[PDB]
Design a protein around this nucleic acid. Sequence first.
DNA 1: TTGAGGCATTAACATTTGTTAACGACGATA
DNA 2: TATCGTCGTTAACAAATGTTAATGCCTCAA
Lengths: 236, 236
Amino acid sequence: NAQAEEFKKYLETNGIKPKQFHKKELIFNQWDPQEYCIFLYDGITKLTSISENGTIMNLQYYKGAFVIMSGFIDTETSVGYYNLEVISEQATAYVIKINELKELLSKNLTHFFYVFQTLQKQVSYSLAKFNDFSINGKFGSICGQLLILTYVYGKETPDGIKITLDNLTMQELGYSSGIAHSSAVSRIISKLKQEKVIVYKNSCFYVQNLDYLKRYAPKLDEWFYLACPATWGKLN
Amino acid sequence: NAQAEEFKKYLETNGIKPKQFHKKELIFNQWDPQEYCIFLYDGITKLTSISENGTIMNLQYYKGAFVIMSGFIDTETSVGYYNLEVISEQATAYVIKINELKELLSKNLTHFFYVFQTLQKQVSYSLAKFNDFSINGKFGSICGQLLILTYVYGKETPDGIKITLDNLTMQELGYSSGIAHSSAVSRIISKLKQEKVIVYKNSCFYVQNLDYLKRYAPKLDEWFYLACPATWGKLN
DNA sequence: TTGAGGCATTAACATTTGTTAACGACGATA
DNA sequence: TATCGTCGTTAACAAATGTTAATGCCTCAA
């Protein structure tokens, strides 16, 4: 993205350097809350939370370039206790103090409205996701997450659309939907295989009937059209 | 509180007159797409969306002062097709043309930070609500929604905390959690006053065991602590 | 006074999902 | 080569939710 490149150099010019992270690494976490602003430039990560009794919840994923902030700007207090785990081999993010940011955008407005732009994407993304998950229960929640993982990591293949995401276990699909038992997602998936909406091959997933998912995730598909026109138009 | 009143007068200074609204009439709807940036100053509203087959989804509630945007600041396209229904008897809001918006923040950046932090409060709220509504299914969803309503619309009484909302009919509660039939939500509420955490009096709700809700909505409870701490202190 | 419609309550029956266990496949290690 | 642990199915049963209908309370209108 061009907007994200102008923002990159704007930080390197102000003394900010990139930090390298590897898989399984947590940029920030829910136990050591330092108010950061992370400009994930290259890589993919998952935002997660862990209840007091050990339940995992994958709130969403983040494919760079994108902006995530663990603290407010004015008050500079925590916005919540979440973990930003790296799931690709390695990722490159520009970690900056929450107070440092205030001054940078105070001089450059075009970089201000860019951060405001991504946060607007965040909002509309959560509402659309909350909409489709809350309607058709769990079966619709799986159909919804898969639709998200195909407009981002989906590549047109001979037999369907392959989700190029490493180690997408059954557990990982459950944490994203609130399901805690892998036997429940397999059952939901077995229904999508008998309906041949999805086929399972080489520990990966290939989508055949993308419209079936759209029926259970209309507001989300609508979001990819309104918020990320590029990535959306690749499969329509 | 004060951060908004300061932003109130900044609009009148630039020639933005408040437009008053009355109950049951929509500011912006899903069918007619116009991008604005509403600054609700007084009154109660709910954000809604109607599925293709008439299914309704209440996404969340809004109480002035607060900001809502039906479009993007950079691309001026709609964030999504939603409806903002006024459910209070009367509500006043400063509707602004989104094109006129970006030019109004570039002048004073202290009000840019204000509108910015409200977005951060929206993102965190969306994540927290998504977290709790997904772990414990529908029963937790109702618990979560009720907890939200107690903090925002709660006044202590000798019989419990009074949820000062008109309507809040069985059907209106299910719309927020994602339940279609009023008998399903009544079955759940039957279990809550069975366990003696709430009671139905005067077609209105008195919650008597707030902590029971905190156990099913832990993320939402801490959101109020970190985001709106004044509201949190009124019941803690 | 009667009667119509809307809401809450409960039933009952179907469907979905939570939960645990057993089975078999696949890889890794010695 | 045998053996161990991880993950995907599948079964089986319990719990929760979807769904529809009936009943009773309440207001409104004539």
